[PDB]
Design a binder for this molecule. Structure first.
Ligand code: FE
Length: 698
C-alpha cells in the first residue's frame, strides 16, 4: 500500500493523476504528516513555502534525488527570522520524469542523519529498462483570474541499452510558472501609512526551469554495476515585488517582471552497486555546485532583504557540496533471521557569499573580534559519519530495528543519534508500530559564522527598543530531536485504516537570541553602543500531532482514499510562541473511478483547518490589532481525468479549486512602523484553474 505508519509512497500513477503545476511540493504536501509552511512565524517570504514534516520546519526536511542529498537552498542567505528567499529544493526534478517519491517521517528517518529531524523526501527518477523506452510530457494550466500565474511544462525521457552491459537514461525539461501580477494582493493588503503608504505584500514569484540529466549504468560483472550521471538545472525567477518586510523602493519597481535571482545547479555523481552471496554493497560520490546569482540586498532592519539601491547589480553566492556514501548489507542466520547494514558517510559544504558578511559597524559601533570591512566570504563544515542498522525478525511478522549513527562535525563536535523501530503483526490484518530516535541538525553555515552580522536600530531587537547586532556563533550545539511515534494500521484487500500519534521533543533548536551577550563600542548618536545577540540554542521545544489514513474500496471500479494531519502542539518552550504556523488539520480525499478500461476519473477535496499567527513580536511583546487575525478553515475541491487513447498516447484534463476559494497575502505576521501585521494571512491561495496534459511514450 501507499501508506504505512511513518511512511508514504507517491507513485508515477499518482503524479500522473493529480499533476503538479511545476514544483513537486504541490503533490508531496498531501501525504500524512506533511505541511507546506515557512521555517518561522515571521511570515517573511511567506509565498515561498516549502515541505514541512510534522511541524519541524523545512530546514529539517532532507530532499534526496535517487538517494543523493540536495543542498542548493543552503546557498541562499538565512535571515534573522530563520527564512531564506528560497523556493525550496523540490523543483529540481521535473514531475513527469519521476518514478516515485518516498516520504519517511520521524524515527524511521533519523538514520538518514543530518537534517532528517522532520523527515526525508526521496525523489526517484525513472530508469532504463531491458529494452529502450522513451516519453514526452506536456502540461498547461489556465487560471480563471488573470492576476494569477499560469504554468507550462514540457519534459522528455529516453532510456535503454547500447551494449549488453551498457545502459543510458536521459531527460530534459523546460517549464515556466508566470509570476502573480504585482497588484494581486491590492485591497487585501494590511493597513499601510506614512512612508510605507502604497506598499504591497507580493504574490507568488514565477520561475523558469531548464533541467538536463544524463546517466550511464556500466555493469562490468555479473555482480557489479557502476553508474555515472551529470545534472544541469537553471531556475530564474520572475520578480513580483516580494521583500522581507513588504516595504518598497524604486529598484523593486524597476524589476517587476524581471529576473532578479538565478540558481544554476550542477551535479556529477559516481555510484557503484554490488550484489554477491554475502549480501549487497552501495557507495557514491556526488559533487553539487550551486551558483545563486541575485541582486544585492540590505542586511539591516527593514532594509534586510530588499534590493539595496546604493550597491545595485548582481552578486553570486557559490555552494560546493561534496557527498560520499558507503554501505554493505549482511544477512545473518544467527538463530534470529536478521539483516545488518554498515556505513560511512562524508560531506563537505563550501559556501562563498560575497554579500552576506558585509554589514558594517559604523552606526552601531564596532564588535571586538569582528572586522567591520572586507570580512571573509568563506564558511565550510565537514561531517564524518559511521552507522550500523540491525533489522531483526524475532518471530515471523515482528521486526525490531536498532541502529546507531555517529557524526563528527568539524566545528560543533561529536553527535550520537541512536534509533529503534518496532513493527508488530497483532493479526494478519493489523500491525502496531512504535519508534523512538534522536535525529540530528548541524547548524547552517549562516548561523555558525561569527562574520555573519545583521543589524536593527531596535524594531527587531528582543527585549528592548535600542539598536542591536545579531551574530553567528561557532560555539553552537547541534539541534537534536527525540522523535517518538506510536501507530496502528488495519490492511486487508485494499481496505486500509491507520492512525499514528507523533511527539518530537526538540532540544537546542537554533534561533536568533533573546539576551544580549555583549554591547558594541562607538558609532552614531542614539544608535551607538548597540547590543550584541548571537544565534543561540533554545533549550526545549515540542511538536505533537496525529497522522491518519483511510482507504475504502467502494466497488472494483472505485477507490476512496483519505490522508489526515492533525497538529496538536508546536511550542518554543522558552518563549511559549509557536515554531511553525501550520493548519490545525489537513484532510485530503481522493475518489478514483476506473470508469472504463481506458478512462479514469478523479475527484479531490482538501480541508485546511484554522491557522493562528505568532503571539509575540520581535521584541517579545504581545502583538495587537490585525497581527492577531487568523485564517478560517476552508476547502479546495478538484475534478480531473486521464483518457488513454492508446498504449502510446494518454490525455489528462481537470480543474483545481472548483469553487474558486481564494486567499491573498496581506503582509507579514506582526506590525512594524507604517505596516500593520497580517497575522496568518501570509500566502496567496490560487483560484479556479483548468489544466490539460498529454503523455506520448513507448
Ligand atoms: Fe528598524
Amino acid at each position: 500500500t501507499k501508506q504505512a505508519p511513518g511512511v508514504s509512497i507517491i507513485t508515477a500513477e499518482d503524479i500522473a493523476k493529480r499533476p503538479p503545476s511545476n514544483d513537486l511540493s504541490q503533490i508531496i504536501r498531501t501525504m500524512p504528516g506533511v505541511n507546506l509552511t515557512g521555517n518561522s512565524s515571521s511570515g517573511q517570504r511567506g509565498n515561498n513555502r516549502q515541505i514541512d514534516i510534522r511541524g519541524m520546519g523545512p530546514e529539517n526536511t532532507l530532499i534526496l534525488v535517487d538517494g543523493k542529498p540536495v543542498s542548493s537552498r543552503n546557498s541562499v542567505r538565512y535571515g534573522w527570522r530563520g527564512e531564506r528567499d528560497s523556493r525550496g529544493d523540490t523543483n529540481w526534478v521535473p514531475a513527469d520524469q519521476v518514478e516515485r517519491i518516498e516520504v519517511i517521517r520521524g524515527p524511521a528517518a533519523a538514520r538518514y542523519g543530518n537534517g532528517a529531524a522532520g523527515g526525508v523526501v526521496n525523489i526517484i527518477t525513472k530508469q532504463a529498462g531491458a529494452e529502450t523506452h522513451g516519453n514526452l510530457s506536456v502540461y498547461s494550466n489556465f487560471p480563471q483570474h488573470k492576476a494569477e500565474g499560469a504554468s507550462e511544462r514540457m519534459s522528455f525521457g529516453l532510456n535503454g541499452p547500447l551494449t549488453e552491459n551498457l545502459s543510458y537514461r536521459v531527460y530534459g525539461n523546460i517549464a515556466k510558472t508566470d509570476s502573480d501580477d504585482w497588484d494581486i494582493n491590492a485591497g487585501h493588503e494590511s493597513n499601510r501609512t506614512g512612508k510605507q503608504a502604497g506598499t504591497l505584500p507580493a504574490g507568488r514569484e514565477g520561475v523558469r526551469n531548464k533541467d538536463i540529466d544524463g546517466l550511464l549504468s556500466w555493469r562490468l560483472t555479473p555482480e557489479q554495476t557502476l553508474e555515472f550521471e551529470a545534472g544541469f538545472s537553471r531556475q530564474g525567477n520572475i520578480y513580483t515585488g516580494d521583500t522581507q518586510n513588504t516595504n518598497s523602493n524604486n529598484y523593486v519597481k524597476q524589476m517587476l517582471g524581471h529576473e532578479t535571482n538565478r540558481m544554476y545547479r550542477e551535479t556529477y555523481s559516481v555510484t557503484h552497486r554490488g550484489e554477491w552471496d554475502f549480501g549487497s554493497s552501495l557507495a557514491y560520490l556526488q559533487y553539487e555546485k550551486t551558483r545563486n546569482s541575485r541582486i544585492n540586498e540590505g542586511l539591516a532592519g527593514g532594509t534586510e532583504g530588499i534590493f539595496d539601491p546604493n550597491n545595485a547589480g548582481f552578486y553570486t553566492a557559490t555552494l560546493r557540496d561534496l557527498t560520499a556514501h558507503g554501505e554493505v548489507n549482511l544477512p545473518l542466520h544467527l538463530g534470529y533471521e536478521q539483516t545488518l547494514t554498515l556505513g560511512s558517510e562524508w560531506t563537505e559544504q563550501k559556501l562563498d557569499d560575497p554579500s552576506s558578511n558585509t554589514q558594517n559597524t559604523e552606526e552601531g559601533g564596532s564588535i571586538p573580534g569582528l572586522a567591520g570591512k572586507n570580512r571573509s566570504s568563506s564558511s565550510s563544515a565537514r561531517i564524518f559519519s559511521l552507522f550500523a542498522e540491525d533489522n531483526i525478525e524475532l518471530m515471523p511478522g515482528t521486526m525490531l530495528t536498532p541502529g546507531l549513527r555517529w557524526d563528527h562535525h568539524d566545528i560543533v563536535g561529536d553527535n550520537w543519534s541512536p534509533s529503534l523501530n518496532l513493527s508488530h503483526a497483532l493479526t494478519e490484518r493489523v500491525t502496531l508500530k512504535a519508534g523512538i530516535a534522536r535525529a540530528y541538525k548541524a547548524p547552517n553555515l549562516y548561523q555558525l559564522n561569527p562574520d555573519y552580522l545583521l543589524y536593527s536600530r531596535g524594531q527587531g531587537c528582543y527585549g528592548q527598543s535600542t539598536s542591536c547586532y545579531l551574530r553567528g556563533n561557532d560555539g553552537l550545539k547541534a539541534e537534536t530531536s527525540v522523535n517518538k511515534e506510536l501507530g496502528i494500521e488495519y490492511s486487508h484487500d485494499g481496505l486500509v485504516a491507520g492512525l499514528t500519534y507523533f511527539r518530537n521533543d526538540y532540544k537546542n533548536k537554533i534561533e536568533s537570541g533573546l539576551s544580549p551577550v555583549d554591547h558594541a563600542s562607538g558609532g552614531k548618536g542614539d544608535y551607538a553602543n548597540a547590543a550584541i545577540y548571537q544565534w543561540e540554542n533554545v533549550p526545549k521545544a515540542v511538536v505533537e500531532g496525529l497522522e491518519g489514513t483511510l482507504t475504502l474500496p467502494l466497488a472494483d471500479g472505485l477507490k476512496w482514499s483519505n490522508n489526515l494531519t492533525y497538529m496538536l502542539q508546536s511550542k518554543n518552550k522558552e518563549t511559549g510562541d509557536v515554531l511553525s504556523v501550520t493548519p490545525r488539520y489537513t484532510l485530503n480525499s481522493m475518489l478514483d473511478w476506473q470508469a472504463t478500461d481506458d478512462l479514469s476519473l478523479q475527484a479531490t477535496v482538501t480541508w485546511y483547518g484554522k491557522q493562528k499567527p505568532k503571539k509575540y513580536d520581535y521584541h517579545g511583546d504581545r502583538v495587537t490589532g490585525s497581527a492577531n487575525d487568523q485564517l478560517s478553515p476552508y476547502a479546495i475541491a478538484g475534478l480531473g481525468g486521464t483518457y488513454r487513447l492508446s498504449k502510446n498516447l494518454s490525455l489528462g484534463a481537470g480543474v483545481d479549486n472548483l469553487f474558486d476559494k481564494r486567499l491573498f497575502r496581506a503582509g507579514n505576521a506582526q506590525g512594524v512602523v507604517g505596516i500593520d501585521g497580517a497575522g496568518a494571512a501570509t500566502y496567496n491561495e490560487p483560484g479556479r484553474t483548468f489544466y490539460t496534459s498529454l503523455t506520448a511514450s513507448f
